[PDB]
Tab-separated table of C-alpha atoms in Angstrom:
chain	number	residue	atom	x	y	z
A	21	UNK	CA	103.929	156.843	-45.936
A	22	UNK	CA	102.470	159.949	-43.873
A	23	UNK	CA	98.759	160.957	-43.747
A	24	UNK	CA	99.353	164.107	-46.024
A	25	UNK	CA	100.860	161.934	-48.869
A	26	UNK	CA	98.336	159.367	-48.848
A	27	UNK	CA	95.250	161.461	-48.748
A	28	UNK	CA	96.643	163.380	-51.723
A	29	UNK	CA	97.218	160.100	-53.555
A	30	UNK	CA	93.575	158.962	-52.681
A	31	UNK	CA	92.172	162.330	-53.649
A	32	UNK	CA	94.116	162.270	-57.075
A	33	UNK	CA	92.300	158.886	-57.667
A	34	UNK	CA	95.150	156.512	-56.988
A	35	UNK	CA	94.020	153.128	-55.667
A	36	UNK	CA	96.803	150.564	-55.727
A	37	UNK	CA	98.707	150.581	-52.401
A	38	UNK	CA	99.443	146.915	-51.931
A	39	UNK	CA	102.196	145.895	-49.323
A	40	UNK	CA	102.464	149.365	-47.954
A	41	UNK	CA	103.887	149.627	-44.300
A	42	UNK	CA	101.492	151.765	-42.344
A	43	UNK	CA	102.186	150.468	-38.745
A	44	UNK	CA	100.666	152.432	-35.638
A	45	UNK	CA	98.902	155.216	-37.814
A	46	UNK	CA	96.188	157.378	-36.478
A	47	UNK	CA	93.260	157.609	-39.002
A	48	UNK	CA	89.969	157.884	-36.972
A	49	UNK	CA	86.891	158.470	-39.265
A	50	UNK	CA	88.834	157.969	-42.375
A	51	UNK	CA	87.184	157.032	-45.906
A	52	UNK	CA	89.132	154.841	-48.329
A	53	UNK	CA	86.593	152.814	-50.195
A	54	UNK	CA	87.637	150.407	-53.074
A	55	UNK	CA	91.328	150.668	-51.998
A	56	UNK	CA	93.959	147.741	-52.882
A	57	UNK	CA	95.941	147.186	-49.525
A	58	UNK	CA	96.829	143.558	-50.097
A	59	UNK	CA	99.616	142.384	-47.729
A	60	UNK	CA	99.800	145.802	-46.053
A	61	UNK	CA	101.425	146.285	-42.386
A	62	UNK	CA	98.968	147.823	-40.188
A	63	UNK	CA	99.976	146.403	-36.713
A	64	UNK	CA	98.328	148.389	-33.733
A	65	UNK	CA	96.784	151.021	-35.966
A	66	UNK	CA	93.891	153.375	-34.775
A	67	UNK	CA	91.012	153.069	-37.359
A	68	UNK	CA	87.892	153.708	-35.210
A	69	UNK	CA	84.686	154.241	-37.291
A	70	UNK	CA	86.531	154.262	-40.625
A	71	UNK	CA	84.800	153.537	-44.150
A	72	UNK	CA	86.557	150.871	-46.100
A	73	UNK	CA	83.686	149.372	-48.113
A	74	UNK	CA	84.851	146.948	-50.813
A	75	UNK	CA	88.652	147.141	-49.917
A	76	UNK	CA	91.071	144.358	-50.852
A	77	UNK	CA	93.057	143.462	-47.776
A	78	UNK	CA	94.041	139.896	-48.364
A	79	UNK	CA	96.844	138.671	-46.159
A	80	UNK	CA	97.313	142.121	-44.552
A	81	UNK	CA	98.779	142.543	-41.026
A	82	UNK	CA	96.169	144.020	-38.647
A	83	UNK	CA	97.316	142.640	-35.246
A	84	UNK	CA	95.986	144.620	-32.191
A	85	UNK	CA	94.497	147.282	-34.642
A	86	UNK	CA	91.594	149.475	-33.162
A	87	UNK	CA	88.660	149.055	-35.742
A	88	UNK	CA	85.592	149.880	-33.385
A	89	UNK	CA	82.616	150.794	-35.594
A	90	UNK	CA	84.434	150.570	-38.839
A	91	UNK	CA	82.589	149.782	-42.299
A	92	UNK	CA	83.952	146.856	-44.257
A	93	UNK	CA	81.193	145.697	-46.474
A	94	UNK	CA	82.081	143.221	-49.262
A	95	UNK	CA	85.844	143.633	-48.374
A	96	UNK	CA	88.562	140.786	-49.179
A	97	UNK	CA	90.274	139.877	-45.921
A	98	UNK	CA	91.256	136.246	-46.888
A	99	UNK	CA	93.989	135.023	-44.669
A	100	UNK	CA	94.321	138.470	-42.889
A	101	UNK	CA	96.136	138.731	-39.527
A	102	UNK	CA	93.533	140.106	-37.002
A	103	UNK	CA	94.860	138.770	-33.717
A	104	UNK	CA	93.714	140.832	-30.838
A	105	UNK	CA	92.076	143.541	-32.826
A	106	UNK	CA	89.132	145.594	-31.428
A	107	UNK	CA	86.245	145.277	-33.791
A	108	UNK	CA	83.450	146.240	-31.505
A	109	UNK	CA	80.374	147.249	-33.508
A	110	UNK	CA	82.009	147.011	-36.929
A	111	UNK	CA	80.034	146.265	-40.164
A	112	UNK	CA	81.611	143.431	-42.174
A	113	UNK	CA	78.481	142.187	-44.151
A	114	UNK	CA	79.210	140.010	-47.097
A	115	UNK	CA	82.946	140.202	-46.602
A	116	UNK	CA	85.373	137.416	-47.649
A	117	UNK	CA	87.204	136.211	-44.513
A	118	UNK	CA	88.283	132.759	-45.451
A	119	UNK	CA	91.469	131.383	-43.652
A	120	UNK	CA	91.573	134.601	-41.571
A	121	UNK	CA	93.421	134.947	-38.182
A	122	UNK	CA	90.863	136.130	-35.508
A	123	UNK	CA	92.420	134.697	-32.381
A	124	UNK	CA	91.550	136.751	-29.280
A	125	UNK	CA	89.711	139.421	-31.425
A	126	UNK	CA	86.965	141.634	-29.741
A	127	UNK	CA	83.945	141.116	-31.919
A	128	UNK	CA	81.374	141.654	-29.202
A	129	UNK	CA	82.087	143.845	-26.258
A	130	UNK	CA	80.222	143.834	-22.715
A	131	UNK	CA	83.101	145.512	-20.761
A	132	UNK	CA	80.817	148.339	-19.386
A	133	UNK	CA	77.716	146.108	-19.126
A	134	UNK	CA	76.281	147.084	-22.704
A	135	UNK	CA	76.548	144.936	-25.890
A	136	UNK	CA	78.570	146.281	-28.880
A	137	UNK	CA	78.227	143.335	-31.252
A	138	UNK	CA	79.862	143.180	-34.638
A	139	UNK	CA	77.834	142.623	-37.855
A	140	UNK	CA	78.998	139.558	-39.941
A	141	UNK	CA	75.797	138.705	-41.786
A	142	UNK	CA	76.499	136.527	-45.037
A	143	UNK	CA	80.298	136.697	-44.489
A	144	UNK	CA	82.656	133.881	-45.786
A	145	UNK	CA	84.506	132.504	-42.816
A	146	UNK	CA	85.511	129.092	-44.516
A	147	UNK	CA	88.460	127.594	-42.481
A	148	UNK	CA	89.055	130.913	-40.471
A	149	UNK	CA	90.834	130.825	-36.973
A	150	UNK	CA	88.720	132.247	-34.284
A	151	UNK	CA	90.162	130.685	-31.132
A	152	UNK	CA	89.454	132.699	-27.946
A	153	UNK	CA	87.663	135.614	-29.617
A	154	UNK	CA	85.086	137.557	-27.655
A	155	UNK	CA	81.716	137.683	-29.656
A	156	UNK	CA	79.139	138.930	-27.101
A	157	UNK	CA	76.002	139.936	-28.777
A	158	UNK	CA	77.544	139.566	-32.241
A	159	UNK	CA	75.271	138.932	-35.283
A	160	UNK	CA	76.449	136.358	-37.946
A	161	UNK	CA	72.991	135.424	-39.710
A	162	UNK	CA	73.668	133.352	-42.766
A	163	UNK	CA	77.513	133.486	-42.556
A	164	UNK	CA	79.625	130.442	-44.065
A	165	UNK	CA	81.598	128.947	-41.201
A	166	UNK	CA	82.530	125.721	-42.951
A	167	UNK	CA	85.621	124.242	-40.848
A	168	UNK	CA	86.036	127.375	-38.738
A	169	UNK	CA	88.122	127.137	-35.407
A	170	UNK	CA	86.111	128.484	-32.596
A	171	UNK	CA	88.013	126.896	-29.699
A	172	UNK	CA	87.152	128.678	-26.320
A	173	UNK	CA	85.369	131.532	-28.015
A	174	UNK	CA	82.837	133.711	-26.110
A	175	UNK	CA	79.361	133.494	-28.101
A	176	UNK	CA	77.102	134.630	-25.251
A	177	UNK	CA	73.959	136.259	-26.750
A	178	UNK	CA	75.217	135.880	-30.210
A	179	UNK	CA	72.911	135.441	-33.299
A	180	UNK	CA	73.874	132.499	-35.608
A	181	UNK	CA	70.579	131.910	-37.358
A	182	UNK	CA	70.887	130.087	-40.750
A	183	UNK	CA	74.741	130.027	-40.411
A	184	UNK	CA	76.714	127.406	-42.014
A	185	UNK	CA	78.709	125.720	-39.200
A	186	UNK	CA	79.835	122.439	-40.936
A	187	UNK	CA	82.885	121.041	-39.535
A	188	UNK	CA	83.447	124.065	-37.171
A	189	UNK	CA	85.295	123.331	-33.740
A	190	UNK	CA	83.426	124.850	-30.900
A	191	UNK	CA	85.129	122.921	-27.942
A	192	UNK	CA	85.192	125.194	-24.950
A	193	UNK	CA	83.083	127.943	-26.450
A	194	UNK	CA	80.690	129.927	-24.286
A	195	UNK	CA	77.190	129.740	-25.733
A	196	UNK	CA	74.843	130.936	-23.168
A	197	UNK	CA	71.915	132.539	-24.819
A	198	UNK	CA	73.286	131.819	-28.323
A	199	UNK	CA	70.492	131.887	-31.215
A	200	UNK	CA	71.091	129.117	-33.676
A	201	UNK	CA	67.779	128.671	-35.345
A	202	UNK	CA	68.166	127.076	-38.810
A	203	UNK	CA	71.939	126.735	-38.486
A	204	UNK	CA	73.661	124.069	-40.364
A	205	UNK	CA	75.646	122.220	-37.525
A	206	UNK	CA	76.458	118.985	-39.437
A	207	UNK	CA	79.966	117.690	-38.509
A	208	UNK	CA	80.616	120.617	-35.902
A	209	UNK	CA	82.422	119.590	-32.746
A	210	UNK	CA	80.563	120.762	-29.558
A	211	UNK	CA	80.217	120.482	-25.932
A	212	UNK	CA	76.899	119.220	-24.507
A	213	UNK	CA	76.186	122.442	-22.906
A	214	UNK	CA	75.431	123.965	-26.378
A	215	UNK	CA	72.368	121.829	-26.429
A	216	UNK	CA	70.949	123.165	-23.371
A	217	UNK	CA	71.761	126.813	-24.012
A	218	UNK	CA	71.260	127.483	-27.662
A	219	UNK	CA	67.969	128.029	-29.478
A	220	UNK	CA	67.879	125.455	-32.081
A	221	UNK	CA	64.716	125.585	-33.955
A	222	UNK	CA	65.341	124.202	-37.427
A	223	UNK	CA	68.999	123.581	-36.753
A	224	UNK	CA	70.461	120.913	-39.133
A	225	UNK	CA	72.299	118.155	-37.289
A	226	UNK	CA	74.039	114.882	-37.395
A	227	UNK	CA	72.615	111.950	-35.699
A	228	UNK	CA	75.641	111.872	-33.440
A	229	UNK	CA	74.571	115.520	-32.330
A	230	UNK	CA	70.975	114.591	-31.920
A	231	UNK	CA	71.960	111.952	-29.551
A	232	UNK	CA	74.167	114.395	-27.687
A	233	UNK	CA	71.170	116.674	-27.493
A	234	UNK	CA	69.118	113.887	-25.918
A	235	UNK	CA	72.000	113.000	-23.616
A	236	UNK	CA	72.293	116.744	-22.657
A	237	UNK	CA	68.668	116.652	-21.472
A	238	UNK	CA	69.352	113.507	-19.329
A	239	UNK	CA	68.615	110.458	-21.475
A	240	UNK	CA	70.926	107.293	-20.583
A	241	UNK	CA	72.467	105.215	-23.274
B	21	UNK	CA	26.722	81.164	-4.032
B	22	UNK	CA	25.271	83.705	-1.491
B	23	UNK	CA	27.243	85.859	1.141
B	24	UNK	CA	26.305	83.697	4.176
B	25	UNK	CA	27.540	80.371	2.490
B	26	UNK	CA	30.743	81.779	1.124
B	27	UNK	CA	31.629	83.436	4.535
B	28	UNK	CA	31.112	80.163	6.266
B	29	UNK	CA	33.181	78.346	3.829
B	30	UNK	CA	36.026	80.922	4.248
B	31	UNK	CA	35.649	80.953	8.020
B	32	UNK	CA	35.852	77.156	8.185
B	33	UNK	CA	39.224	77.359	6.114
B	34	UNK	CA	38.038	76.496	2.617
B	35	UNK	CA	40.077	78.241	-0.185
B	36	UNK	CA	39.593	76.691	-3.526
B	37	UNK	CA	36.564	78.538	-5.257
B	38	UNK	CA	37.939	78.441	-8.881
B	39	UNK	CA	35.362	79.105	-11.653
B	40	UNK	CA	32.591	80.144	-9.290
B	41	UNK	CA	29.809	82.482	-10.566
B	42	UNK	CA	29.522	85.550	-8.320
B	43	UNK	CA	28.061	88.243	-10.827
B	44	UNK	CA	26.685	91.665	-9.401
B	45	UNK	CA	27.532	90.852	-5.708
B	46	UNK	CA	27.822	93.495	-2.941
B	47	UNK	CA	30.788	92.698	-0.672
B	48	UNK	CA	32.272	96.239	0.309
B	49	UNK	CA	35.164	96.043	2.911
B	50	UNK	CA	35.299	92.231	2.472
B	51	UNK	CA	38.694	90.222	3.426
B	52	UNK	CA	39.543	87.042	1.438
B	53	UNK	CA	43.229	86.755	1.365
B	54	UNK	CA	44.999	83.823	-0.264
B	55	UNK	CA	41.863	82.786	-2.125
B	56	UNK	CA	41.706	80.676	-5.357
B	57	UNK	CA	39.283	82.302	-7.714
B	58	UNK	CA	40.669	81.395	-11.050
B	59	UNK	CA	38.301	81.810	-13.886
B	60	UNK	CA	35.485	83.209	-11.667
B	61	UNK	CA	32.595	85.344	-13.059
B	62	UNK	CA	32.400	88.697	-11.267
B	63	UNK	CA	30.967	91.007	-13.717
B	64	UNK	CA	29.706	94.448	-12.236
B	65	UNK	CA	30.505	93.470	-8.766
B	66	UNK	CA	30.777	95.968	-5.752
B	67	UNK	CA	34.196	95.180	-3.942
B	68	UNK	CA	35.048	98.766	-2.731
B	69	UNK	CA	38.041	98.694	-0.217
B	70	UNK	CA	38.238	94.934	-0.130
B	71	UNK	CA	41.439	92.925	1.186
B	72	UNK	CA	42.496	90.280	-1.328
B	73	UNK	CA	46.121	89.860	-0.780
B	74	UNK	CA	47.706	86.934	-2.633
B	75	UNK	CA	44.614	85.800	-4.336
B	76	UNK	CA	44.676	83.606	-7.644
B	77	UNK	CA	42.439	85.394	-10.237
B	78	UNK	CA	44.014	84.232	-13.368
B	79	UNK	CA	41.526	84.727	-16.307
B	80	UNK	CA	38.743	85.937	-14.086
B	81	UNK	CA	35.836	87.945	-15.483
B	82	UNK	CA	35.796	91.388	-13.540
B	83	UNK	CA	34.225	93.548	-16.242
B	84	UNK	CA	32.760	96.965	-14.849
B	85	UNK	CA	33.602	95.912	-11.395
B	86	UNK	CA	33.871	98.542	-8.558
B	87	UNK	CA	37.219	97.969	-6.858
B	88	UNK	CA	38.005	101.443	-5.434
B	89	UNK	CA	40.737	101.241	-2.859
B	90	UNK	CA	40.892	97.497	-2.806
B	91	UNK	CA	44.310	95.486	-1.783
B	92	UNK	CA	45.659	93.073	-4.259
B	93	UNK	CA	49.408	92.788	-3.303
B	94	UNK	CA	51.103	89.826	-4.955
B	95	UNK	CA	47.881	88.593	-6.708
B	96	UNK	CA	47.853	86.415	-9.880
B	97	UNK	CA	45.584	88.340	-12.436
B	98	UNK	CA	47.165	86.924	-15.673
B	99	UNK	CA	44.716	87.309	-18.673
B	100	UNK	CA	42.000	88.673	-16.182
B	101	UNK	CA	39.055	90.768	-17.948
B	102	UNK	CA	39.001	94.198	-16.240
B	103	UNK	CA	37.370	96.168	-18.945
B	104	UNK	CA	35.771	99.279	-17.557
B	105	UNK	CA	36.510	98.357	-13.889
B	106	UNK	CA	36.767	101.277	-11.328
B	107	UNK	CA	40.123	100.733	-9.447
B	108	UNK	CA	40.630	104.365	-8.194
B	109	UNK	CA	43.392	104.166	-5.287
B	110	UNK	CA	43.733	100.295	-5.214
B	111	UNK	CA	46.959	98.699	-3.982
B	112	UNK	CA	48.287	96.148	-6.627
B	113	UNK	CA	51.922	96.133	-5.615
B	114	UNK	CA	53.950	93.130	-6.943
B	115	UNK	CA	50.854	91.476	-8.831
B	116	UNK	CA	51.186	89.315	-11.858
B	117	UNK	CA	48.909	91.053	-14.572
B	118	UNK	CA	50.545	89.744	-17.728
B	119	UNK	CA	48.146	89.615	-20.773
B	120	UNK	CA	45.356	91.181	-18.685
B	121	UNK	CA	42.455	93.131	-20.251
B	122	UNK	CA	42.472	96.634	-18.817
B	123	UNK	CA	40.735	98.441	-21.638
B	124	UNK	CA	38.847	101.683	-20.532
B	125	UNK	CA	39.705	100.894	-16.838
B	126	UNK	CA	39.680	103.780	-14.149
B	127	UNK	CA	43.310	103.512	-12.440
B	128	UNK	CA	43.606	107.223	-11.656
B	129	UNK	CA	40.488	109.382	-11.124
B	130	UNK	CA	40.418	113.326	-11.225
B	131	UNK	CA	36.509	113.450	-11.751
B	132	UNK	CA	36.042	116.018	-8.855
B	133	UNK	CA	39.335	117.702	-9.256
B	134	UNK	CA	41.353	115.362	-6.801
B	135	UNK	CA	43.735	112.654	-7.764
B	136	UNK	CA	42.968	109.068	-6.784
B	137	UNK	CA	45.940	107.165	-8.305
B	138	UNK	CA	46.149	103.409	-8.190
B	139	UNK	CA	49.462	101.723	-6.911
B	140	UNK	CA	51.078	99.416	-9.423
B	141	UNK	CA	54.733	99.324	-8.091
B	142	UNK	CA	56.937	96.359	-9.293
B	143	UNK	CA	53.925	94.712	-11.126
B	144	UNK	CA	54.205	92.364	-14.018
B	145	UNK	CA	52.222	93.758	-16.994
B	146	UNK	CA	53.946	91.919	-19.791
B	147	UNK	CA	51.758	92.150	-22.957
B	148	UNK	CA	48.875	93.634	-21.089
B	149	UNK	CA	46.071	95.525	-22.883
B	150	UNK	CA	45.458	98.930	-21.379
B	151	UNK	CA	44.045	100.722	-24.398
B	152	UNK	CA	41.885	103.827	-23.264
B	153	UNK	CA	42.430	103.366	-19.623
B	154	UNK	CA	42.338	106.472	-17.260
B	155	UNK	CA	45.597	106.647	-15.152
B	156	UNK	CA	45.626	110.127	-13.677
B	157	UNK	CA	48.181	110.332	-11.003
B	158	UNK	CA	48.869	106.579	-10.981
B	159	UNK	CA	52.239	105.191	-9.602
B	160	UNK	CA	53.962	102.401	-11.494
B	161	UNK	CA	57.511	102.732	-10.392
B	162	UNK	CA	59.584	99.635	-11.446
B	163	UNK	CA	56.657	97.748	-13.219
B	164	UNK	CA	57.311	95.421	-16.228
B	165	UNK	CA	55.329	96.641	-19.161
B	166	UNK	CA	57.274	94.872	-21.836
B	167	UNK	CA	55.008	94.794	-24.843
B	168	UNK	CA	51.876	96.312	-23.302
B	169	UNK	CA	49.092	98.178	-25.284
B	170	UNK	CA	48.566	101.689	-24.009
B	171	UNK	CA	46.801	103.293	-27.077
B	172	UNK	CA	45.006	106.477	-26.205
B	173	UNK	CA	45.486	105.939	-22.583
B	174	UNK	CA	45.301	108.944	-19.945
B	175	UNK	CA	48.862	109.095	-18.131
B	176	UNK	CA	48.612	112.705	-17.046
B	177	UNK	CA	50.687	113.095	-13.925
B	178	UNK	CA	51.522	109.374	-13.713
B	179	UNK	CA	54.786	108.200	-12.148
B	180	UNK	CA	56.688	105.588	-14.342
B	181	UNK	CA	60.145	105.897	-12.986
B	182	UNK	CA	62.464	102.990	-13.416
B	183	UNK	CA	59.594	101.048	-15.290
B	184	UNK	CA	60.191	98.647	-18.233
B	185	UNK	CA	58.360	99.986	-21.310
B	186	UNK	CA	60.100	98.136	-23.844
B	187	UNK	CA	57.955	97.488	-26.952
B	188	UNK	CA	55.104	99.191	-25.331
B	189	UNK	CA	52.586	101.034	-27.718
B	190	UNK	CA	51.814	104.561	-26.472
B	191	UNK	CA	50.164	105.881	-29.697
B	192	UNK	CA	47.644	108.660	-28.696
B	193	UNK	CA	48.452	108.379	-24.986
B	194	UNK	CA	48.056	111.521	-22.878
B	195	UNK	CA	51.350	112.197	-21.009
B	196	UNK	CA	51.118	115.681	-19.683
B	197	UNK	CA	53.258	115.807	-16.544
B	198	UNK	CA	54.307	112.177	-16.790
B	199	UNK	CA	57.350	111.146	-14.673
B	200	UNK	CA	59.629	108.724	-16.594
B	201	UNK	CA	62.974	109.081	-15.017
B	202	UNK	CA	65.114	105.870	-15.566
B	203	UNK	CA	62.386	104.216	-17.549
B	204	UNK	CA	63.353	101.667	-20.261
B	205	UNK	CA	61.686	102.975	-23.256
B	206	UNK	CA	63.734	101.052	-25.819
B	207	UNK	CA	61.434	99.811	-28.709
B	208	UNK	CA	58.295	101.475	-27.375
B	209	UNK	CA	55.962	103.351	-30.010
B	210	UNK	CA	55.509	107.037	-29.030
B	211	UNK	CA	54.260	110.406	-30.087
B	212	UNK	CA	56.680	113.265	-30.217
B	213	UNK	CA	54.763	115.282	-27.571
B	214	UNK	CA	55.919	112.635	-25.016
B	215	UNK	CA	59.383	114.026	-25.425
B	216	UNK	CA	58.230	117.684	-24.558
B	217	UNK	CA	56.066	116.614	-21.611
B	218	UNK	CA	57.744	113.622	-19.717
B	219	UNK	CA	60.485	114.042	-17.259
B	220	UNK	CA	63.164	111.692	-18.726
B	221	UNK	CA	66.236	111.863	-16.717
B	222	UNK	CA	68.125	108.548	-17.036
B	223	UNK	CA	65.403	107.280	-19.340
B	224	UNK	CA	66.863	104.457	-21.542
B	225	UNK	CA	66.027	104.942	-25.226
B	226	UNK	CA	66.649	104.006	-28.770
B	227	UNK	CA	68.543	106.041	-31.235
B	228	UNK	CA	65.290	106.462	-33.256
B	229	UNK	CA	63.786	107.866	-30.129
B	230	UNK	CA	66.573	110.131	-29.253
B	231	UNK	CA	66.235	111.649	-32.771
B	232	UNK	CA	62.480	112.104	-32.178
B	233	UNK	CA	63.406	113.938	-28.793
B	234	UNK	CA	65.762	116.169	-30.763
B	235	UNK	CA	63.041	116.732	-33.484
B	236	UNK	CA	60.381	117.260	-30.829
B	237	UNK	CA	62.500	120.199	-29.570
B	238	UNK	CA	62.661	121.716	-33.014
B	239	UNK	CA	65.829	120.106	-34.719
B	240	UNK	CA	65.360	119.757	-38.545
B	241	UNK	CA	66.816	116.669	-40.476
């Protein structure tokens, strides 16, 4: 569908656009709140600064899409393909992102020196795949990351306060300056470096993990 | 016995003086190496800078004695009464001090600002009573403190590297700047502050203790 047709359809009050193929489209600053776009094809699309509050995008293809500064509050993105997408500074507060594919995604940019961290406060990321994602300065306060895959992700200066990290895999993840106060870490897989880098006041941990903390500050068993 | 008699007896080669009453005597800079003084009464005596290398003083009464800078290398002081004795700067390297009473003793003075720490390297202090002793800047590298009582003792800036502290009671002990690298702490009773003050590289610890270390750096279980 082209831009003229779909703006007419939205303006007329139509909201069900599920499975629609919209690959490579240019829609900077567009506003399409409450839209049903489940299973839609949006590969390599430009959606910089768009307002998509309360959209349904479950299982949608968003690979290498530009979403810099976009609004997605309380959106359904369960199992959505976001591999390599540029989400620097975007607002995803309270969104459902369980099982979502976020491998290599840009969720916190420091490219020019300055931090453009994405907002993920209170988001559902149960079992989400974030392997290799860049989250420099991102804010994830209170998010549910039960079982999430964070292999080799960049979490430098990221805020994870009060976040549920139970069973999350952080092997190889960069955590220099990460802020994990009150986070639930029970059962998460981590490197010892984490214990020496992250702020961990109130962090809820396993016994295994507390011993690794001790060992990371030089204690020998 | 008076000073003239006993210097004559030592000079003639006599060495067995066990149980002798020598209370309040003035013997500064005296040299009486290899002497048998087991069970002797030496309450409130002045022995500043004396050489007593390899003496047997088991069970001797040395309460409030001045022993500042004295030499006691490889001496037997098992169960000796040293309550309130002034041992600032003394050399007790390799001495047997098991079961000894060291309550309130001065083993490291900072009275005028400057540290006069006593030397206890490789000493046997199994089950010794050190409650309330002042050990500012003392050096106890490799000492055996299995089961020693250290209640409310001052260990500020003291070196306890590679020391055996198994089953020692450190409740209330001041440990600011203490150096415990490689020390065997398994089974010792400690306050959480210790974990935030002492240097603990290689320190051998219980699981209980490693969790207290974690908890002392703010982790919540």
